[PDB]
């Protein structure tokens, strides 16, 4: 019964190559790749989708809170990055067309544009770019039930949101409990204190004030990761994006990664930051792209062209920022608070 | 006004994709990847046939004759070999399926398979891989897959002429071989002939030892071989064996190009036999990252398309699927610069 | 305080490039990029020994059992993996090399060969590949090089010492989960279950039942396991065989998650060093056609020889696959054994 | 005879691993990768230097005059391009270090730091990044950061001829140019002239609609561009800003081979100039993957060698460090196939080989 072909509905996906070079009557041979590219690259993105909404569902469903299903989501996630890296890599297929044969072709495609990707701005929603902090020059271009959509993405529980309420929950961070971040403010304040005293020993120096300078300025940022109000602060500012709650899970995974529970989930946080390092490198890679096609013309979609998209290659775009960040707060291995054996049984 | 997903045909694209688990009430997550991965590598199988396609043309119609042609040649050669490179790396996504999961949709599949894939079978064909070249299995086996119009194309593919057999005919006119002309061939076997005489004194000559039995059995080898080059009748006996594939007079247009690559009229045409065998490189590359997936995959079970399956797919990572055998195998005839014959100044301003 | 320069002792790195050509009096150009590729492979060949000698060193001392390590073992068997994806890719650069430019500098290597890379043997004997199944390596080195190469074949191996942990994956114990006689049960109910449905097209599938029986009850078989293990046709114990498979059908449970990434890992590293031999292969046709090596080998076709399931250490993890059932017959896990499998 | 480990000197090579972790009696597993990451790295900056010094050459004693050495040229252009797509891939190895796992050995390396690597900046001079175009972090020149003969070497690699210069000269001398030959200039701002008129007379002909006025203003935007090309002292202004790096003729040149590329003489310096900017290209790109994996490794924190970190990392993903910016831009000039100046038979046999 089953043929190869009919399973792959090759009679559909191999029946969509239409140069509009050719439909206009000057039929150029390049414009096949770059309908190609764009083809496989929409496959690939309706595959991230599919995955990453199933990641999303097995969070919103609670499936989450049993452990069991961690092999699954940090596959998936994984997954998700591995096909990112040869999204990264598709573009050297391009690059090996001139921008002189692409200027042949180039004005039977206005005013169509990359705008117009309705997987792209789904994907984009739904891992969690901030709706506001979007570069100022997005869903005009679309109508419909695209429209319809792209405000489900948009509304709907973001993998960032779903991520943040199973940070929320780490154990660990009960006052009551383990007390993680009681004893870390604790810990990180008597180390530096420590750190002082042995930097106050030493000779009146141009590197003793050196020494001390550096210090001020680390004790400053350390403490500073205690101050809930600043976090707030920046948080409205959407120069953070995880509640303060989840960013205490976060830290806890990171220096306890070893402890059994802790394992896969420290790879699924690794996987997020995976993921906004090659969805910004996938930017990159079509800008370097662009400037060679284009110089400084305006795009078909309206844009600056190459200029408009340099500035989408931002933090600004960086979802899991906030787990970049806290290496910022990384300290000596014998200041984190001790697993009592207790502890260690739980974990 | 044009639209993106219009222009691109999303409406076909991005309604392909049926998963036959779920057509069975019995829908599993992974056959998605399974799906979208043969559809992406079928994308650039119907890309490398286009490039292919557009160069048997050139080369067919005598366009290749014009020399402001080689760079679009080579460009598209080249092209071919970047998106089989991506190909190769593409198997990278399909292992991230455990062969646990592919066991809990496998059963939908039958008895389909890659033996069905008509693009592959046109790519085979059109670069030149002969029904002769085929394992015994594939040989008869992969025609009958295919019916009609799907047929009727596999046909046209075996019947036209291949790139093997256009880059032969262009080869066969390759500047320099001329007898009346530069006369490469007369010169290289006289050249060859003076060299091995020199380096036979020169072994001669050595104080006794066991290193100089060694050398002289070491240059009796070379000798051998290199003169064998010129053994016509021995060119036609591999022919026949299917050992080598190009005619003498292309395999001498092919030496040309590689000893005087640096003349102006050869950088291109050497930049293109680099890239042929680049392309047979990465087709096996391709068969052999296909072998180590399966065989995860599968271990010793038979596939559904009716082949031992891991074992059948190992016999395909052979020489006889190399269309361009001879342009590895002519660096057993590489010399030392010093005998290739000199061009005076009237041939190096004819190149 | 450090310099750079100094930290990664470039005084030494920078200063180990000697072209043979130019030493003779006939300097070639690419036999610069020659030796750097080499040194470039030889650099990560010691950062492979480290990783794997550090995972064997955590197997060997007990540290394994102790399952709050398996973070560790899994990232650095994973490392590997990664550096041997560079080092297949890293061929690229040296392809850019043609044939023609290397001749200009190949009498100068003779009689040095890649037979004579020690780091090569000691990661092909590390992982496990035995003597005896190796393709006709020691006469090749003296002195403390042969010593260490002895060493590498005499110490326990990757593939011995995942062998002895395999052999005590929870739930193979016959007084307790009793594994291997529950799916033995399971698959015989299954079997005489789908016979019952078959007998009840219709030719094809009487036909393909029985060779599918034949294979799958061929694994209960012990005397038939000893016989291929034997004949090196398999490397595993049948008792690590059955862990394997465990880990397999119940990866889900946490206990298992992290394993069967390993276990993953181990099949990722056989397919990378079998693409990195392939890879070796593919360029050498290209430079050396059918000339026989430096290191008197017949060149491309002992070569191609060594892409075979001989050189494959985790073979039976690959082979594994062959004896997968549908997931309805896999011994249910009651909620005495799932808190068993729990962190 | 020779010997495998004797011939790649690995004596050197693989006694060159000093965990500074373990010399104070600390020793951290990760360090160790690390290490050889970076010996690799150095190893392949080295392998670059030696085709690019080579190319340098090839341009600079006159060899290039004849077409018979553009194949090695852009053979050896092309292998740096290889080259650093791996550099741009080695990333990923170094990436399965955690931060947790560094911030256990990162205090052994203070205050050395990637600022040191005499091979990056030799590199980065050689192909012709300029000195006042760098991005500063210490109000001081990057050179401050080397002394002795490592500071001699950098100041012969800032005032010898970069790349950047020497294709500028075989730019300016691209056949075609001559006013009293083809003339390509003449004719390009004659063709576009006229394209640009018979375009405006097609505009001038719709009815008046919306689509008139987005075509009007998208026209005399075109245009302005377009007969920008022409303005020499626009150039000059540009050049002295450091916004372009080409000579006015170089820039001819280089857009003589885009527009002709098929014409045999030209097929292999189109392949060059292709070349120029994959490398340029493979060099922000290598900066970027350093920015991603030092954003997870120290976040905020500030560098080993005094600079801001991961914040002055991206301030070099930046044009100052593209060296053929001007090759990219001319496509910002590309114009219809028939406005390109017809060859006649003439100067198509002197593009013959
Ligand atoms: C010759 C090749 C390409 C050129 C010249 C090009 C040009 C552009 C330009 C100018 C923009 C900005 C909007 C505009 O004014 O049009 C853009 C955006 C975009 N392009 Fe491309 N593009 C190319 C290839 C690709 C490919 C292969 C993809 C694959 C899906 C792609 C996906 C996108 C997406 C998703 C956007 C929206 C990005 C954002 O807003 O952040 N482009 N492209
Ligand atoms: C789980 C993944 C895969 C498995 C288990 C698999 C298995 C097989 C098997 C067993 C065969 C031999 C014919 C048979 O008996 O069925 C085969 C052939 C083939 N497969 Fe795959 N395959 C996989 C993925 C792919 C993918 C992604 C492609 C992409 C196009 C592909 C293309 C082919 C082709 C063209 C053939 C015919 C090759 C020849 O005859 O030389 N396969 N495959
Ligand atoms: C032009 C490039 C190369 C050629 C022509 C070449 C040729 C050969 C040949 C002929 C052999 C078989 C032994 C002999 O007869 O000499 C061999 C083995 C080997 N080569 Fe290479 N090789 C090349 C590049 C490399 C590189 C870059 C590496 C990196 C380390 C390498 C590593 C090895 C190793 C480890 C062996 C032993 C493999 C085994 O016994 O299975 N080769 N090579
Ligand atoms: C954990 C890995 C790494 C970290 C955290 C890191 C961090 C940094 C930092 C902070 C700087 C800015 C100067 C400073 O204040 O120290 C820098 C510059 C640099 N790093 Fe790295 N780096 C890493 C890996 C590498 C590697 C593997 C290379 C390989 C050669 C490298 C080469 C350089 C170079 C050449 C510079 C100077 C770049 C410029 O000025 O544009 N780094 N690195
Ligand atoms: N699985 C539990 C506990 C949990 C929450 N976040 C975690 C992070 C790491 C380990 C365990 C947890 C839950 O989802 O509520
Ligand atoms: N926006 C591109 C044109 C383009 C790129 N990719 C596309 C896909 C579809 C339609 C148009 C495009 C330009 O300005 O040149
Ligand atoms: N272009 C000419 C001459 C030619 C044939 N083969 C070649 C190989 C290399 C260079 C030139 C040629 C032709 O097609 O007949
Ligand atoms: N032949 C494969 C199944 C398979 C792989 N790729 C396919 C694509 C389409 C249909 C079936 C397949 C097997 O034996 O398991
Ligand atoms: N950690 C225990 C139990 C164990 C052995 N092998 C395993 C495989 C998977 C899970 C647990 C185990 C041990 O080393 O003895
Ligand atoms: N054995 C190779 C030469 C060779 C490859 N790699 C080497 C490294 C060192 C010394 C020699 C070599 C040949 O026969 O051509
Ligand atoms: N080879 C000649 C002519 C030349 C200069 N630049 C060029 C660019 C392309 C082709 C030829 C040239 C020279 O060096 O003066
Ligand atoms: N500059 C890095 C440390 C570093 C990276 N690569 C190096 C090489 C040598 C010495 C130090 C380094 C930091 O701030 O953490």
Redesign the interface.
Known sequence: ??????????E???????L?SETKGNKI?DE??F??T???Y???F??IL??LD?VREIFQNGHVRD??????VV?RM??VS??L??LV??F??LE?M???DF??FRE????????????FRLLENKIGVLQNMRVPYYRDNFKGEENELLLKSEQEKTLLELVEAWLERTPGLEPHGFNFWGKLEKNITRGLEEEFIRIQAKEESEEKEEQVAEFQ?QKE?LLSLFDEKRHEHLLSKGERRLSYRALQGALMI??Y?????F??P??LL?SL?DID?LM??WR??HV?MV????????GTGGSSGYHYLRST?SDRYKVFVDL????????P?HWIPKMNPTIHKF?
Request: charged letters at 20%.
């Open positions: 019964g089953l043929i190869y072909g009919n399973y792959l509905h090759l559909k996906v191999l029946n969509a190559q239409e509009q041979h096949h790749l309908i190609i764009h083809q496989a929409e496959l690939w309706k595959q599919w995955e199933s452990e069991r299903n961690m092999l699954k596959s994984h997954r591995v096909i890296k040869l890599q598709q050297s297929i090996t001139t921008a002189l200027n042949d039977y495609l206005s005013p169509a544009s990359g705008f117009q990707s309705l997987q300025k940022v990171y220096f990664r070893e402890e059994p529970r394992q896969v420290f790879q690794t930051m390092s910004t490198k990159y890679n370097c400037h060679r096609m284009l110089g400084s013309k305006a290659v970049f960040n806290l290496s910022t707060y990384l300290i291995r974990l």
